[PDB]
Design a protein around this ligand. Structure first.
Ligand SMILES: C/C(=C\CC/C(C)=C/COP(=O)(O)OP(=O)(O)O)CCC=C(CF)CF
Ligand SMILES: [Mg+2]
Ligand SMILES: [Mg+2]
Ligand SMILES: [Mg+2]
Length: 318
């Protein structure tokens, strides 16, 4: 339990989105057995999308559903030996990230064709400058998986919280998730305001809160697997604390960050005057605050407590 002073929201079209969530990944070759389908439904991935994107319905919401489907199918391809070899991790991430640049060869693994279909749908109808900034966010995410594989290979665990966050902030995938809230909402935050120091601090709070929530929710699955790059394990190594002290420390950190997040929300009216936002930009920035940044913070908190997540080698083979 944590202090998330934000209203819980869920798309009114969530029942349909959960009922139809399997048709897209099955048609892409991402779910190939019936047991794989049930394993997927147990993740609650359409549920998570409907809470990340409460403002989306219909096809817009289905794009968010497919993003969560692909994202967790993708992340599963690295829990095994591939996530241990940075050469093989890079080999796969480069075939996925290639879709950001052009058409994939038909020999690409299905996980890459899945990403290509999502990225094609994310960009259509957005400004080219928005597509380029989002493609950069994806490349940061893929490169982060190669850094995590480098840490496991050379058996160099993250010795500090600082060194962990510099790596986990990219692999958590929050920024590509927030980017899709703009696409699913059919709006764009003023690009000069996205780059502002105030917005970056708010975005960084949303990332930190998410990875802290995830490191606590999946501590058992990572303790039973000897993983050393988890915030509760790193705090015990960095500060010599117990498990009960590090966990309560992480509650205080998500506590302090969400109060600082409120402080920054109150600065946005002044931030808009600084960048001379017209009324339309003022509204798009308001939508970004409530339908993209707030939703990625609150939506993750509700879903980490309800997700069942707390044989796929075919998807990464040419
Ligand atoms: C791109 C997205 C998800 C991809 C899957 C990712 C990055 C999952 C990151 O969590 P992991 O520690 O790698 O494994 P887990 O499933 O939690 O045991 C959006 C979901 C946002 C999250 C924020 F925390 C997922 F936890
Ligand atoms: Mg994982
Ligand atoms: Mg991972
Ligand atoms: Mg985890």
């Amino acid at each position: 339990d944590f202090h998330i002073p934000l209203p819980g929201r869920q798309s009114p079209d969530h029942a349909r989105a959960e009922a139809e969530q399997l048709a897209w990944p099955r048609s892409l070759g991402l779910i190939r057995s019936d047991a794989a389908a049930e394993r997927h439904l147990r993740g609650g991935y359409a549920d998570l999308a409907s809470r990340f994107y409460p403002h989306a319905t219909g096809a817009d919401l289905d794009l968010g559903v497919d993003l969560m489907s692909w994202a967790f199918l993708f992340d599963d391809l690295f829990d095994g030996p591939r996530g241990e070899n940075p050469e093989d991790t890079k080999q796969l991430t480069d075939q996925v990230a290639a879709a950001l640049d052009g058409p994939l060869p038909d020999t690409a693994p299905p996980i890459a064709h899945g990403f290509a279909d999502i990225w094609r749908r994310t960009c259509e109808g957005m400004t080219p400058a928005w597509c380029a900034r989002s493609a950069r966010h994806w490349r940061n995410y893929f490169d982060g998986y190669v850094d995590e594989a480098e840490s496991r290979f050379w058996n160099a665990p993250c010795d500090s919280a600082a060194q962990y966050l510099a790596m986990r902030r990219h692999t958590i995938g929050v920024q590509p998730t927030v980017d899709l809230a703009e696409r699913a909402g059919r709006f764009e935050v003023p690009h000069r305001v996205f780059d502002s120091a105030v917005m970056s601090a708010m975005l960084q709070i949303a990332v930190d809160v998410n990875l802290l929530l995830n490191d606590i929710a999946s501590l058992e699955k990572e303790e039973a697997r000897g993983e050393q790059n988890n915030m509760v394990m790193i705090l015990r190594r960095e500060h010599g604390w117990s498990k009960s002290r590090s966990v309560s420390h992480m509650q205080n950190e998500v506590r302090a960050r969400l109060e600082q997040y409120l402080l920054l929300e109150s600065c946005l009216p002044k931030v808009g005057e600084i960048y001379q936002l017209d009324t339309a930009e003022r509204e798009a920035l308001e939508r970004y605050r409530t339908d993209a940044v707030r939703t990625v913070i609150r939506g993750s908190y509700d879903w980490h407590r309800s997700s069942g997540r707390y044989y796929l080698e075919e998807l990464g083979s040419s």
